[PDB]
């Protein structure tokens, strides 16, 4: 199963910005709000706005914050990037212990759907080898973040600002860079090629075998170059001496060695799944992590 | 594709979880208002899980026997009464978190977010869809009793189920918050069987809307059928029949495309029969069966 983070504790932080006509959602931790800066943008600066010009002509009084039925005021503005910075006169006080963090492409995380400041909708996603994240998304979303949590720690890793006209996402992380070659302006933009997340394919085998699925193991193995070889071929990613090592933990479990379950997927990409599925799927999955599948097996 | 499982904001419940104990067995409670609801099993030692005499293991309790905490902290334990497979432990605090709430009993095909729980601490948030046999497949690990599932509108938590049990085949089954199960098991550390399962037809003609209104229309023909012989067909092929109820629900989607219900049921009915023919509906050939009609319609308009 995909699960997801509670999402209690960024709920908290959850709340609307707006500026102009445009209403986006922010991140309110400790006395500041966090929010995608094309908030401050028209219609007539969407497709080259030029934010530090945009932004030098704006007072604390145009940002509109609220949370719940509270508005909160703004008393300064800066700008991180892609990221605007809303100085408030309150401390958040359901502000839980935090970090800001740029994940790695493959890595997962949970995100926290919202519209109007008011949270949605929970789910799992991966960031993706060419840095899209393939979200759900409306009207309205921008602002919603992306995060892990560890202990105590809500660890943000996403916030969003844009769908690609093929649907998938993109956005930045909270010091405002994106992940991947993306902008944020009102255009047309392609991603680069996607592969899919090795490591992660082979994680969710070892999951479908621990749940007691078996049908498309194999008698046989592989090099490791031999096998990114044909994963290359198929638009795989490359599997590195630490993924395997990574793995090692749901090979002893099984005690199928990684490269034993190499040799499976490479049978399953060159031969196909001829009809069959696996944990439900008719398609290969690749959003579970190696640490996912651990802590849920 | 475009279409995922999405669970509701988990906060509101994550504030209603505690951890009861009776002795050294642990599982999870719902604390709402100055009750806390748990499975009735927390007063089994794991000996009299095998035949348990309910009503005689209780007559032996006292509200002193129940370890109720959230966190670390002690909750007082002021009474106690059976209803049906669930305990209600009355303590002597209001929860200042417990929101605007309902108790439902959800029908088959619907869905609901899980909040998998280890000794009162939330662990992960997934969606499931009660499958016409009464089972769900969630991820439940040992410890995970009295995890809750639930659905959220406006401002109301509706709870529909509590987990107590894995079945052979490594599906799950729990109650109503009522302590009514779900299908024909009981809380015995017996084998039990699931019931054969089949198709949820009703997520499969809202999953076609769906597709419809993303403008993948191939498989509407120029038919309709009766309800019956619908129902009749489809039996044939695994799926459930639909009830008026179905026909119902599907108002929405079938007023948003203007498609009636029934003629998209005459377009199933094709697919059952003849296949797909190496086509694709939103890009698979398997047609999808766990998104009820208020799923599509959220994250098809928001």
Same mark, same amino acid.
């Given at each position: 199963?995909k699960?997801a983070?509670?999402?209690?504790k ?9 500026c102009?006509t445009?209403?986006?959602n922010?991140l309110?931790?400790?006395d ?5 800066? !094309?908030?401050?943008?028209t =219609?007539?600066?969407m497709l080259?706005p030029?934010?530090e ?5 704006? =007072? +604390?009084?145009?940002?509109?914050v609220?949370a719940?039925?509270?508005?909160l005021?703004?008393?300064? !503005? ?10 408030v006169?309150?401390?958040?006080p359901?502000?839980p212990?935090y970090?800001f ?13 919202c519209?109007?400041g ?6 799992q996603?991966?960031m993706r080898?060419?840095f899209?994240?393939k979200? =759900?998304?409306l009207?309205?979303?921008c602002?919603?973040?992306?995060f892990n949590?560890d202990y ?17 996402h $993109?956005?930045? *992380? @909270? ?14 933009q392609? $991603?680069?090629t *996607?592969?899919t997340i090795?490591?992660?394919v082979?994680?969710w085998?070892?999951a479908?075998?621990i ?13 490791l +170059?031999?096998? +990114?070889?044909v994963?290359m071929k198929?638009?795989?990613?490359? @599997?590195t001496?630490? !993924? ?12 199928? $060695?990684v ?6 997927l490479?049978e ?5 799944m001829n009809?069959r599925?696996? @944990?439900?799927? $008719? ?5 579970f992590?190696?640490?996912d599948?651990?802590r849920?097996?």
């Amino acid at each position: 199963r995909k699960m997801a983070f509670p999402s209690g504790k960024v709920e908290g932080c959850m709340v609307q910005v707006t500026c102009g006509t445009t209403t986006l959602n922010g991140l309110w931790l400790d006395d500041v709000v966090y929010c995608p800066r !094309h908030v401050i943008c028209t =219609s007539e600066d969407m497709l080259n706005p030029n934010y530090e010009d945009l932004l030098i002509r704006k =007072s +604390n009084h145009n940002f509109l914050v609220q949370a719940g039925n509270v508005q909160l005021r703004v008393i300064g !503005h800066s700008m991180q990037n892609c990221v605007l910075k809303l100085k408030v006169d309150t401390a958040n006080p359901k502000t839980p212990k935090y970090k800001f963090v740029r994940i790695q492409p493959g890595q997962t995380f949970s995100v926290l759907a919202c519209y109007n400041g008011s949270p949605s909708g929970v789910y799992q996603c991966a960031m993706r080898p060419n840095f899209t994240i393939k979200g =759900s998304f409306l009207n309205g979303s921008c602002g919603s973040v992306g995060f892990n949590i560890d202990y105590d720690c809500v660890s943000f890793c996403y916030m969003h600002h844009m769908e690609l006209p093929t649907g998938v996402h $993109a956005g930045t *992380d @909270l010091e405002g860079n994106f992940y991947g070659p993306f902008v944020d302006r009102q255009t047309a933009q392609a $991603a680069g090629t *996607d592969t899919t997340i090795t490591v992660n394919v082979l994680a969710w085998l070892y999951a479908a075998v621990i749940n007691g699925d078996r049908w498309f193991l194999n008698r046989f193995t592989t090099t490791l +170059n031999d096998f +990114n070889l044909v994963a290359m071929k198929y638009n795989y990613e490359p @599997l590195t001496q630490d !993924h395997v090592d990574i793995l090692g933990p749901l090979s002893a479990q099984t005690g199928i $060695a990684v490269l034993d379950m190499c040799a499976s997927l490479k049978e399953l990409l060159q031969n196909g799944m001829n009809g069959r599925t696996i @944990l439900g799927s $008719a398609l290969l999955e690749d959003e579970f992590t190696p640490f996912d599948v651990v802590r849920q097996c």
